[PDB]
């Protein structure tokens, strides 16, 4: 079952620090952990709503990797590699 809470409590507190110690931050306040689950559910909504629209155009029911490489390209963040 995709329990709503479980899916977002999936980005756990240790991995919201180790994804931030790769940027330089030395001390992290307690409330950063809540806001940073908010900004990764309003980014995935926008990338996974423009991969569904291309998938429907070709009358397919599987979201292929090339479609995500074409959803990201439109919004200004091209990804080179996991696609062609």
């Amino acid at each position: 079952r995709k329990v709503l809470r479980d899916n977002i409590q999936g980005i756990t507190k240790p991995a919201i620090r180790r994804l931030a110690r790769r940027g330089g931050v030395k001390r992290i306040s307690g409330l950063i952990y809540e806001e940073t689950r908010g900004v990764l559910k309003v980014f995935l909504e926008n990338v996974i709503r423009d991969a569904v629209t291309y998938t429907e155009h070709a009358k397919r029911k599987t979201v292929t990797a090339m479609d995500v490489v074409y959803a990201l390209k439109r919004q200004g963040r091209t990804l080179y590699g996991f696609g062609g």
């Binding site: 423009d50 629209t53 291309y54 429907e56 155009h57 070709a58 090339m66 074409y70 439109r74």
Partner: peptide
């Protein structure tokens, strides 16, 4: 671009509906 990725050669009504959606 949508026409080329699919491989089809015509810009028909369905294509100007996916563009308005995106």
């Amino acid at each position: 671009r949508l026409a080329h990725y699919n491989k089809r050669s015509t810009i028909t009504s369905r294509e100007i509906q996916t563009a308005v959606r995106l």
